[PDB]
């Protein structure tokens, strides 16, 4: 699940949504909606992908 990943990987890294947002250079609010799974094709997909350290494909589907 999109949301599942985006929360749990953050938890895994030990970053809150706040530090994650900052590393990504977005804001916690975007990360909040994203965590809830509101975004599908976000402009900052690869940024999230890098900051988490997961594939685009994993974040899309799960690979």
Swiss-Prot record:
GO terms for MF: DNA binding
Keyword Disulfide bond included in the entry's annotation: no
Signal sequence segment: none
Highest taxon in the source lineage: Viruses
Coiled coil: none
DNA-binding region: 17-36
Keywords: DNA-binding, Repressor, Transcription, Transcription regulation
Domain HTH cro/C1-type: 6-59
Residue pairs linked by disulfide bridges in the UniProt entry: none
Biological function: Binds to two sets of three contiguous operator sites in the phage genome.
Complex formation: Homodimer, when bound to an operator.
UniProt-recorded name of the protein: Repressor protein CI
Taxonomic source organism: Enterobacteria phage 434
Name of the gene: CI
């Amino acid at each position: 699940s999109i949301s599942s990943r985006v929360k749990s990987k953050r938890i895994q890294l030990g970053l809150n949504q706040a530090e994650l947002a900052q590393k990504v250079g977005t804001t916690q609010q975007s990360i909040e909606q994203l965590e809830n799974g509101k975004t599908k094709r976000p402009r900052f997909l690869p940024e999230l992908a890098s900051a988490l350290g997961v594939s685009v494909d994993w974040l899309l589907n799960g690979t």
